[PDB]
Paper text:
This resolution allowed us not only to build the correct atomic coordinates for rRNA and RPs in the 80S ribosome but also to describe ribosome solvation and metal ion positions, as well as chemical modifications of rRNA residues.
The resulting small subunit (SSU) and large subunit (LSU) structures and the cryo-EM map of the entire 80S complex with bound ligands were subsequently used to model the actively translating 80S ribosome in the pre-translocational rotated-2 state, including tRNA-binding pockets and intersubunit bridges. Despite the expected codon heterogeneity in our ex vivo 80S ribosome, the translated mRNA chain was well resolved for at least 12 nucleotides. For both A/P and P/E tRNAs, a codon–anticodon interaction with the mRNA was observed. In addition, the solvation of the tobacco 80S ribosome has been modelled, including water molecules, polyamines, magnesium (Mg2+) and other monovalent ions. Using polysomes as the starting material for sample preparation allowed us to obtain the tobacco 80S structure in a different physiological and conformational state from the recently reported 80S ribosome from tomato. Moreover, the SSU in the tobacco 80S structure is rotated by 10.6 degrees relative to the SSU in the tomato ribosome.
Author numbering:
A (entry chain b3): 3 to 161, 182 to 230
B (entry chain G3): 2 to 125
C (entry chain R3): 2 to 127
D (entry chain s3): 305 to 404
E (entry chain q3): 50 to 242
RNA sequence: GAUGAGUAGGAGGGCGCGGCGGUCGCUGCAAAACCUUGGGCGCGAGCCUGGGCGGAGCGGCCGUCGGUGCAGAUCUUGGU
RNA sequence: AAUUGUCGGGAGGGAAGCGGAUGGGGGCCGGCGAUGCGCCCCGGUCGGAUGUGGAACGGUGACGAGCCGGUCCGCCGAUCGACUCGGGGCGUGGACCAGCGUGGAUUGGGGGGGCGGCCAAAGCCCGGGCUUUCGAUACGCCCGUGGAACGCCGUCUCCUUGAUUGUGGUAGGCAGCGCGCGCCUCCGGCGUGCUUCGGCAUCUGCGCGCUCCGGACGCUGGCCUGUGGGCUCCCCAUUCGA
């Protein structure tokens, strides 16, 4: 089994090497030599017979239309380069609009996992859409924060009362986050204060 | 705007179906539409085109003229999209294989007596 | 019944084509009439005037004549006429004719309920 | 005598995609475009690497004597390009034109 | 092979110019064999001769473009309709982009997009043209079957110029748009395609 | 696949009214007609329907027929 | 119907009416907008072979034979199936409206890079000579295969963005490309030919897969009798047209 790609991609859909070099690297010559100057022929995989589906209980009077095959498969949501672990984010929408929070990681669904910390500004471990967030240049060390066991399933609704386990988890996660925050002076006040636009403040000119 | 005559549309009119309401003629038209589509035969295309034509565009053929044109070709099936009428100026009637939309009674009797056959277009 | 139609219904215009000057003269009715006057601004299509109908406003053929519920109308005068829609209940709905009596309307409604046929005016004369 | 029946004649028109944007359509219309793009990218990368390393070779396509001849010919051509007429054909306007 | 040929042709032209300068003489470039013509006036109030010539050139709509082989007859025909069109010497890039983006072939008098080489093969296979690159080479070099290839190419339906026009009522020489703008037709093609 | 201007004028396909030959139906458990900021279909001529009033007939479909479609005529009669 | 009175709603700086777009108010609409489906357990009803007899009958053939066949009824075995039957579990599921993600088509922007042409740029700078000025301390000329940085034009390419939009519904097609079918010391290397010495569609076969590849899919939320949603209906206001 080859441990490295044979043909690195210069760009999407174009390989760095040509067909002749690919032949040489793949070693089709070697296979021909070993098999006696002829490529080995492999029989086509046998298809699995369909299961004995029971007869239908009803017969529709119309032939429902089967949709045509769509060959496009969605790709994972991209994370903006301006957002990295420990980055300070500004929430632009929702009940926490204007709040400054800390970014921890991106979940499988593409949403961003953030914490206030809860004690500083009352924002708990939450999921925020990247489209409703501003990434600032302020970064805080988050190496000591462990959120491995927290994932997209942590926030799934079982369908009024917050379990004490979630509160304990928030406290455990926020202890290290607050300890790291304490290193940077005034970061406590920065995180506890919300962002707002004053007179003659231009968002298209603010750098963040 | 586009510099075209009548927006590039045709201004010629031709028959695309019989104007008659004869059900037998309609069935023949269906038959020869299928033949034209699935064989691409020039003879079939001509027959289909003539099946649409009006009465004056399907003139009859006299028996004497039919005999004159069939002379030397009695082994071939003579086909006319129209009527075949008898001629009292024709004395000798040979055995002929004739296909037409209609035969007059005298012409049919003379052909059958001479030993030919009168055929329809389905038989053709 | 689940309607078979899937394409959304699109109306190019939902306003009526009212006859010009029917607002002005009572004797002139609203039903459309194409002006033929030599000087008629409506006929000449002067901007800001009454619009004239044309084939360009034609509805999409797939959704043509389809009611908002997603079915097509069919007028039924009796329960015997109702059974014609037994094999078309996913495309056609039944509307009871205006002159049917309440007694026959009840039977038609019951039969349609049995046959899973939509009635547009099943609450009439109840 | 009927010809074989046909079932795949009523195919939907294929949507036209501009080959200048998407690669697959470009390759389908012209496979050599792949090689052209690969060679162009590799050449650009090589040029950038040479410029960055500053180890570029000192290449002289034309030898010294022929370069001197080329320079002399170019200088003569430029001189004749900028040359001006003597304006001696207009006698009545010599003073105005400044020939004297 | 075609790409190599184009590169070699450009290099040869440059070398010929340089060697002419070195020898001290002049090299007269070969006259353009191909023109691209774009209609710039509408169809209103047309003179009979102008309208007929525009039909013969296959320019029936404003902002339609067509290739034209350079000939005495064709040039004299174009001289009559000069005020209604602007034309020039297309680039290899211009021709390639036109055929790739807006190239439509004529099959049975129908306009079919050139989404596959089979469309070209069906019509020009007898002449050895079976691919888009073959068509481009034939058009640019004005080969033996240039007439067939060009007639196969449906007139190009170009959009309105991206940056507008200067003045279509005046010749390009006076600062307008009508007439022969030679090598400057390429930038107009960029803006019109 | 291409295409879309239209007075005078020509033609095609359709809508609507009243009879006749057939056919399928509705109606005192309420027909025709009329009324209605009820609802819907058709580009449109028009059509289907809720509700009211009315109190005795009426409609769809296939052919076929005609004293068959109004905004004008200092149009006619009546009414205002 | 014209026309008139009354009540209720509404509007009104020298006409009114009208076309187009929204909005305020009113009026109307529940096929206005779903709650089913699949797999199991329990209980209740109705039927259960290719076996054996009867009743009538059909396809084909030739409204003959032969062959084949369905419906209904009676029995020995078999002990299964169904229910718009009831209860209990697991999964899944609707209309409409929004947000988001990834992409196709079309299109308008932004930021770079490579190559070539020119007086084989012009200029600037470094050295070697010649020249010697009035806007006084200049203009300047060529010699070097001297060195950096540009300019215009042409051309090849990379990245990143806003807007409109998804027409079709039996295809894994076409094109390009990866992994296995050999090995090693695995940012790679090892074979035969042609090369411009960089490289090359020269060997390029099968199986399984991927993509900018024969026209949009996926996730989440709000709401469902409500002060909700919709409206082609009605009265008005406003901008444009008239
Ligand atoms: K009126
Ligand atoms: K018209
Ligand atoms: K009747
Ligand atoms: K009504
Ligand atoms: K009638
Ligand atoms: K998009
Ligand atoms: Mg066009
Ligand atoms: Mg003029
Ligand atoms: Mg009468
Ligand atoms: Mg009144």
């Amino acid at each position: 089994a080859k441990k490295s790609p044979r043909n690195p991609e210069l760009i999407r859909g174009v390989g760095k090497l040509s067909r002749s070099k690919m032949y040489h690297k793949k070693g089709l010559w070697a296979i021909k030599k070993k098999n006696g100057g002829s490529f080995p022929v492999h029989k086509k995989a046998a298809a699995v017979a369909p299961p004995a589906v029971k007869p239908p209980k009803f017969y529709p009077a119309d032939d429902v239309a089967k949709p045509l095959v769509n060959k496009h498969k969605p790709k994972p949501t991209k994370l903006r380069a301006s957002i990295t672990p420990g980055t300070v984010l500004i929430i632009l929408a929702g009940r926490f609009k204007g709040k400054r929070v800390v970014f921890l990681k991106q979940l499988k669904s593409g949403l961003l996992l953030v914490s206030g910390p809860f004690k500083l500004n009352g924002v708990p471990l939450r999921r925020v859409n990247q489209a409703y967030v501003i990434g600032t240049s302020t970064k805080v060390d988050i190496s000591g924060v462990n959120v491995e066991k927290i994932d997209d399933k942590y926030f799934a609704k079982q369908a009024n009362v917050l379990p004490q386990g979630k509160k304990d988890d928030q406290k455990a996660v926020d202890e290290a986050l607050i300890k790291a925050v304490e290193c940077v002076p005034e970061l406590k006040a920065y995180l506890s204060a919300r962002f707002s636009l004053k007179s003659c403040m231009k968002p298209h000119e603010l750098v963040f | 705007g586009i510099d075209l005559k009548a927006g590039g549309k045709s201004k010629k009119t031709k028959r695309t179906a019989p104007k008659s309401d004869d059900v037998y003629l309609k069935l023949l038209v269906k038959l020869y539409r299928f033949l034209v589509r699935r064989t691409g035969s020039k003879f079939n295309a001509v027959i289909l085109k003539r099946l649409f034509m009006s009465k004056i565009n399907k003139p009859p053929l006299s028996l004497s003229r039919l005999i004159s044109y069939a002379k030397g070709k009695e082994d071939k099936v003579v086909v006319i999209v129209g009527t075949i009428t008898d001629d009292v100026r024709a004395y000798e009637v040979p055995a002929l294989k004739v296909c037409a939309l209609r035969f007059t009674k005298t012409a049919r009797a003379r052909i059958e007596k001479a030993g030919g056959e009168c055929l329809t277009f389905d038989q053709l | 019944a689940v309607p078979l139609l899937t394409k959304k219904v699109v109306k190019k215009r939902v306003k009526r084509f009212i006859r010009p000057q029917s607002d002005r003269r009572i004797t002139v009715k609203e039903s459309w009439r194409r002006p033929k006057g030599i000087d008629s601004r409506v006929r000449r299509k002067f901007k800001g005037c009454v619009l004239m109908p044309n084939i360009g406003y034609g509805s999409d053929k797939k959704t043509r004549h389809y009611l908002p519920n997603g079915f097509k109308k069919f007028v039924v005068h009796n329960a015997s006429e109702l059974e014609v829609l037994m094999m078309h209940n996913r495309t056609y709905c039944a509307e009871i004719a205006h002159n049917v009596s309440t007694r026959k309307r009840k039977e038609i409604v019951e039969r349609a309920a049995q046959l899973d046929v939509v009635i547009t005016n099943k609450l009439a004369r109840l | 005598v009927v010809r074989p029946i046909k079932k795949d004649v009523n195919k939907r028109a294929t949507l036209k995609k501009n080959p200048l944007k998407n690669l697959n359509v470009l390759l389908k219309l012209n496979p050599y475009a792949k090689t052209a793009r690969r060679m162009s990218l590799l050449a650009e990368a090589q040029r950038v690497k040479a410029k960055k390393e500053k180890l570029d070779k000192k290449r002289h396509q034309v030898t010294k004597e022929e370069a001197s001849a080329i320079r002399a010919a170019g200088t003569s051509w430029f001189k004749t390009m900028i040359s001006d007429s003597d304006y001696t054909e207009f006698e009545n306007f010599t003073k105005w034109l400044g020939v004297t | 092979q075609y790409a190599k040929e184009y590169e070699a042709q450009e290099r040869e032209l440059i070398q010929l110019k340089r060697e002419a300068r070195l020898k001290g003489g002049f090299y007269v470039d070969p006259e353009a064999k191909l023109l691209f013509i774009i209609r710039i006036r509408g169809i209103n109030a047309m003179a009979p001769q102008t309208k007929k010539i525009l039909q013969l050139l296959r320019l029936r709509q404003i902002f339609n473009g067509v290739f034209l082989k350079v000939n005495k007859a064709t040039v004299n025909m174009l001289h009559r309709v000069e005020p209604y069109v602007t034309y020039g010497y297309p680039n290899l890039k211009s021709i390639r982009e036109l055929i790739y983006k807006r190239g439509y072939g004529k099959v049975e008098k129908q306009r079919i997009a050139l989404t596959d080489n089979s469309v070209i093969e069906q019509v020009l296979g007898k002449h050895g043209i079976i691919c888009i690159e073959d068509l481009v080479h034939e058009i640019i070099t004005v080969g033996p079957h240039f007439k067939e290839a060009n007639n196969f190419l449906w007139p190009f339906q170009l959009k309105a110029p991206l940056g507008g026009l200067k003045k279509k009522r005046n010749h390009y020489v006076e600062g307008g748009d009508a007439g022969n703008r030679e090598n400057y037709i390429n930038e107009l093609i960029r803006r019109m395609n």
